[PDB]
Amino acid sequence: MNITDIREQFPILHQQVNGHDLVYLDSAATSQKPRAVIETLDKYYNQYNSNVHRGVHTLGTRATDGYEGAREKVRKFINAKSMAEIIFTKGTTTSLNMVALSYARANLKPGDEVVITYMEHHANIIPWQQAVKATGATLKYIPLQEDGTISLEDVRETVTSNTKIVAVSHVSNVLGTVNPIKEMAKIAHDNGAVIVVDGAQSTPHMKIDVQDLDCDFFALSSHKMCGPTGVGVLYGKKALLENMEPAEFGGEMIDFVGLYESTWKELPWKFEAGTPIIAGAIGLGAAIDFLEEIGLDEISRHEHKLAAYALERFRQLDGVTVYGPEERAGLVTFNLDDVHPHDVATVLDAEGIAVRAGHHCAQPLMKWLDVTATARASFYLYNTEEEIDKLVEALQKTKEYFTNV
């Protein structure tokens, strides 16, 4: 896996910010796109843009072929059984909302439990809050270990026979944790519950096998995996998606429409109201082709390389706290002793280094960590050890600078 060759594919990387070479370390907020994706979008709008699913004229046929072929690439990419289980959405937030609306709100009675965790992104928290509110059910949290991982025994004790939904992240956008999704699916099924995986931060960086994970729902976002903004995927087990009613209504999702009553389409289109995100989904398919040609396991190896490197070099700086486990994905969330993370991020951007500062859409986790805010540096398949060197050097310079005041 030659990473110079990969970086030459991303035009955004080759610029300067405030006089310094750009060091983009914020892929966990959003990733950059290779020429293959951008040029897929260009070819779409230049050559075969048309509305889909009325194979009547040639460009319509070409566009439909592109869109549904993107659906098939997504099916292969996460090892789903059928394209009917692959639904295009606006992003992970919308997919989780669709499960919360069309599954939770229809299958929850008082006394039923929805269990999540303290490390969950807001997208995997608030929909469940609102659903238990609407149904009178109960929201429960799985406690975290002091290194920010989840114990299987805490899972077994928190999920009871009254649990109908367990909702959990695959990889934490803050701690870097990789959660035991497979074992947790077994534990949820033993108690008669479904399991909903927020896969927003796992899909870009590691292979997904929904058959091996046996997850009932899986949600992912294109913009974090080299794909266009505005598009993501909901995977649901076909059997579950058959009995869920649509979250949105309109054209393209109906069969017969009367004055007062309508019947829906078969899956997947039952859950795709309106003109779909045609260009965005085709570009996501291009992103998938790109990743598969690099190789997802090679990308995982690269990220483990960079994460081990980052942890070791961060431990070479005194006065820096890193949050989370040692086994992790390619991100380091941290703080500097007596320096606010926003300030760290500002000085790093003055050095041309892009990190995030704030709560990372995980306020309960921030409270659990006993901090109000954090800095985070996130790595992807275009990032190098030289860039982490620059990060830790700038962190040292920042701490020297704030000591001399």
Place this chain on the structure above:
Amino acid sequence: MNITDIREQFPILHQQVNGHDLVYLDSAATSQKPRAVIETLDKYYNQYNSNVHRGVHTLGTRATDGYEGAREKVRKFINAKSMAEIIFTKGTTTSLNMVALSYARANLKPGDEVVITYMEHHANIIPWQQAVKATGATLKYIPLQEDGTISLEDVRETVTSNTKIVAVSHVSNVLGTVNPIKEMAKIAHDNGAVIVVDGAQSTPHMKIDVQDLDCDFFALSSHKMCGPTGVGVLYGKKALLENMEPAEFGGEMIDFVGLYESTWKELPWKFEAGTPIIAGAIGLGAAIDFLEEIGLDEISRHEHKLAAYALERFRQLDGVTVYGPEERAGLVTFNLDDVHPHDVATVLDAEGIAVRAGHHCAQPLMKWLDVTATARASFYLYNTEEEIDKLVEALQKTKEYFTNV
């Protein structure tokens, strides 16, 4: 308004389909994009793609500036009062669903009436069906005149003091009708109802003034107005949007998140859960700049030119039925005597001409017209009289061909 100059801006137009020069006459299903829009997307992904609203590093600031500047361009484009009234969505279908979910389902009791029309696109029908189902309210239809327009007196007789929502199209994607949205807003307000305009087919072709129309909600789609797929707009009167609860939940739309309770953001972000359609909205802003530089009233004049031309030349063919009024937008929905519309569309595509055939997501209207399917040809700012000449010549050739069998 030089239309050769405009056509040279759309690369998709300059190709051949089945040996013939492409004649794209299906803009009412979806429009084509000028270089300015496609290159706006390219510049975004090549130079300043980053997640928005955490103005922490330079690319994040550039992307936030682009996204919110797109919001401001949309505000100017439809003469809304405040950016807080401009909400980015997936498209018109989603915007209408958001009104049906967050307004209708919270303000409808049994005995309340939701009135629509027989000419409405499915996107402006089924959400209301489901909302009156969920609330026990009543769905009513405004009857149509025999030329497919709406009488103001039929409006006054159908909307009663028990009506809370009137939902109506601005321009009909099938009949070409321009509905009296302004007078209808007055009539709905006199009865204490709100008015929801499906503006999907008016926004691309004519100026929108929500202050002059006094609509309470207005929905539009970017892909029909030279913009990227996957993005549209909901406009609501700020006062109404303040009291509506969000349709989706997650990050970017919250203020404080507790274990069980959260508070929302101010408008507009209260209604934008998750990472937004960044590139799509910026490209929509580019589309708006492009149209404004051509001039919307000039585009309206061009479409009236082409529509009058098309009607006159269609009346020069015997055995063709055109549906709808004489005063219309730039589209002609029709049928050939004893030729099925799908067949017409197929032979026209063999001539390289792109039309649609089917029900055009308006099944109640099809039943009202007493037909099962239809052919439709739709014009936009890149279409010429020569292309309509080709259309009517190919229609004549089609009818001769199906007579000689």
